[PDB]
Design a protein around this ligand. Structure first.
Ligand SMILES: [Mg+2]
Ligand SMILES: [Zn+2]
Ligand SMILES: [Zn+2]
Lengths: 83, 49, 146, 215, 146, 110
């Protein structure tokens, strides 16, 4: 229940494949629910493709909460997780 | 015989190993949060990579 | 009378001397006694291994048991051109031996620490496990993927 | 005959070497002079002129070393006693317990000859200040910790166990277990809740450490 | 760092004492392997250099004239011959180290991986292509171990 | 033992008579063959079961082939003992198994 503060963070600084897939799914679901996007569609209508473009421009407004087995967690913004 | 035995060892080992996943502290644990490997393979390396 | 044992351990079906493609004439026995062979004179107990995992466990311990499991599986799929990464075998040995004893992948073995009555039912023996859980009033959480 | 006697003297010499090693790596004052004892010297010292191997005057006292006592402050001296009767009875077990109580020995090793009486399991677990490790001479002809298939088990102190359970943010129940009466656990005199560090070696991942807790 | 079992530094005389083995030891071995490979390449270059009569600067030099280049006395012939045979640039070494470190970092198991299920399938899918009956090469005539 | 009565040809048995005499008394018939200082003995031979040599290996009596094993970067093996089994369906072809003679590495080339 106690958040590990941003200054120290034990878990990997890289986005995992599962984190990428879940972020894309969540953002695509939000877009499919008419959420505003922060990228240039250039004619794109697919929420998944728009979410992929957002992830490419590193503009998805979500943060990954990685719970440790000991019950704690640390937050990693999508932008600060590197691919 | 192989067709008849397909899906038996995989199913049994699956029932055994379904819930073992890598944790964010690099430990392999059961779904009861009990440690099976403090590090995967004693190396932490994915065989796929 | 002509069936009693006067010499040799009463656990060996037969002993055979083999050659490991060298000048070394090892003997490997088709028996069920490992401690007796190790404590037999003229044999090195430092390097004397059986292929019975449960025998290794009873004689040498759980760590040697998991080593024996890993090596036996690696030998079994190394004789068939089965290129499986050894980490999968290591994980199998660890999951089989992490409770302190060699627990198999059978219905009795699965009742190790899981307590997941629904997972156990979906595996095998649904009704007996369900009735045991209802009678003991088990309170298994929902954590398994099953 | 003579073949039985010579095999018996060699076997007793080997078992004596094994218990010396077990006490030495449990952490006690035993060095290579009384570990590496040749069979001829065993005959010279612990074998009567008659030749029949006696198992009373090689029972010895083991004291903790400075390093062992510093790591584990609570560890008394050790009394390793060898039985002579194939089937041990209540009387000799009672006199062994009396010896333990009267000499204030934190533990006592009882290496019997052939078998142990059924009544022992009611009688041995009654010693508050101490404990008794019950052994068989054939079960320790060869010490298993010298086997190529047994990784080096290192028992951890209470401070080390606390440090491990904190570095991993763990409870004891989440640890992998090693059984009471496990062949290596008995060799090391492990107790419930005592964590052992296992140094195992792998071909594709090198040397790495795992941990087990005695239950 | 390789702390103790109690969390203290190791005295650099017990660094590999084998009760201070922990995690990060595979990483240490990997770094040592990288150094060993680079040292093999450097030793090959040095052996070629000294086989040409000129100095094989395997060890760093330490003298008053250590500033001057030790290839001035060479008459422009074996210099270009050695550069023809082995020419290891600093950019090349740095690129190799970057690639190797990147690959090792990428090879680490990712959290959340269903590693147990992956291992189960990796051990069981090979178990479908193997015969239940034990088939042996014609002429082995060894003990029929399954 | 395996002795039979001359009268009824039933099997003879040793019976303890008076003064502990071991006679060859016949059940089912009044026949008595006593032992007056005579040694009735049955001797049957048994096999010697001699020593056996080292097992070794008869791999020279196996079918090699001309194939380079995947572990050609460790050992230069161009031969492999083989046997072919059609563990595939009748529509599929046959599968071949191999074992390098230079390292002992087995693999199925299908
Ligand atoms: Mg087909
Ligand atoms: Zn008759
Ligand atoms: Zn080969």
């Amino acid at each position: 229940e106690k958040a590990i503060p941003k200054d120290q963070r034990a878990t990997t600084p890289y986005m995992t494949k599962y984190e990428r897939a879940r972020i894309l799914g969540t953002r695509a679901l939000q877009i499919s629910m008419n959420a505003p996007v922060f990228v240039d569609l250039e004619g794109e209508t697919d929420p998944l493709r728009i979410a992929m473009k957002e992830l490419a421009e590193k503009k998805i407004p979500l943060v990954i909460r990685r719970y440790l087995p000991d019950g704690s967690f640390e937050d990693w913004s999508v932008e600060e997780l590197i691919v | 015989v192989k067709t008849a035995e397909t899906g038996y060892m995989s199913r049994r080992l699956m029932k055994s190993l379904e819930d073992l996943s890598c944790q964010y502290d690099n430990t392999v644990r059961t779904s009861a949060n009990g440690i099976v490997q403090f590090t995967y393979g004693g190396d932490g390396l994915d065989p796929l990579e | 009378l002509p069936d009693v044992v006067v010499k040799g351990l009463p656990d060996i079906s037969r002993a055979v001397i083999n050659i490991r493609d060298d000048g070394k004439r090892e003997l490997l026995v088709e028996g069920y006694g490992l401690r007796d062979v190790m404590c037999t004179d003229g044999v090195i107990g430092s390097r004397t291994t059986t292929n019975h995992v449960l025998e290794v466990f009873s004689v040498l311990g759980i760590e040697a048991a998991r080593y024996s499991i890993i090596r036996e599986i690696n030998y079994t799929m190394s004789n068939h051109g089965m290129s499986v990464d050894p980490r999968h075998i290591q994980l199998l040995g660890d999951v089989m031996t992490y409770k302190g004893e060699v627990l198999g992948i059978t219905r009795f073995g699965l009742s190790k620490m899981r307590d997941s009555v629904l997972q156990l039912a979906s595996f095998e023996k649904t009704t007996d496990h369900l009735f045991d859980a209802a009678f003991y009033m088990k309170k298994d959480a929902v954590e398994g993927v099953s | 005959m003579d073949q039985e006697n010579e095999r018996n003297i060699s076997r007793l010499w080997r078992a004596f070497r094994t218990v010396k090693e077990m006490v030495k790596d449990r952490g006690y004052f035993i060095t290579q002079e009384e570990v590496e004892l040749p069979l001829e010297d065993f005959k010279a010292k612990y074998c009567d002129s008659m030749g029949r191997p006696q198992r009373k005057m090689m029972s010895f006292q083991a004291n903790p070393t400075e390093e062992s006592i510093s790591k584990f402050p609570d560890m008394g001296s050790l009394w390793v006693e060898f039985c002579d009767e194939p089937s041990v009875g209540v009387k000799t077990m009672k006199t062994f317990v009396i010896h333990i109580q009267e000499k204030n020995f934190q533990t006592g090793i009882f290496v019997y000859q052939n078998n142990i009486t059924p009544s022992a399991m009611k009688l041995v677990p009654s010693i508050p200040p101490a404990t008794i490790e019950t052994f068989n001479e054939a079960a320790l002809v060869v010490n298993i910790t010298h086997h190529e298939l047994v990784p080096k088990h290192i028992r951890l102190s209470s401070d080390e166990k606390r440090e491990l359970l904190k570095r991993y943010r763990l409870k004891e129940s989440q640890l992998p277990r090693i059984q009471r009466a496990d062949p290596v656990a008995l060799y090391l005199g492990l107790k419930r809740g005592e964590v052992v560090k296992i140094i195992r070696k792998s071909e594709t991942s090198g040397r790495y450490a795992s941990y087990r807790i005695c239950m | 760092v390789r702390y103790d079992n109690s969390g203290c530094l190791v005295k650099r005389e017990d660094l590999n004492k084998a009760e201070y083995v922990d995690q990060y030891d595979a990483e240490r071995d990997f770094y040592h392997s990288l150094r060993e490979y680079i040292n093999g390449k450097a030793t090959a270059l040095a052996n070629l250099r000294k086989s040409r009569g000129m100095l094989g600067l395997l060890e760093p030099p330490a003298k008053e004239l250590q500033g001057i280049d030790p290839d001035e006395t060479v008459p422009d012939n074996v210099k270009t011959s050695v550069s023809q045979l082995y020419r290891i640039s600093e950019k090349s070494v740095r690129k190799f180290l970057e690639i190797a470190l990147f690959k090792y970092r990428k090879a680490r198991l990712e959290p959340g991986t269903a590693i147990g299920a992956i291992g189960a399938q990796s051990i069981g899918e090979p178990g479908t292509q193997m015969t239940l009956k034990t088939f042996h090469f014609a002429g082995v005539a060894s003990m029929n171990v399954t | 033992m395996l002795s039979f009565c001359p009268s009824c040809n039933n099997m003879l048995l040793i019976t303890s008579g008076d003064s502990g005499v071991y006679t060859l008394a016949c059940r089912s018939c009044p026949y008595e063959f006593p032992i007056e200082g005579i040694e009735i003995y049955d001797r049957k031979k048994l096999p010697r079961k001699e020593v056996d040599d080292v097992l070794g290996g008869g791999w020279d009596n196996v079918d090699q082939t001309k194939t380079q094993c995947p572990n050609y970067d460790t050992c230069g093996g161009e031969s492999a003992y083989f046997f072919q089994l059609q563990i595939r369906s009748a529509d599929e072809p046959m599968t071949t198994f191999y074992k390098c003679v230079n390292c002992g590495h087995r693999w199925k080339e299908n």
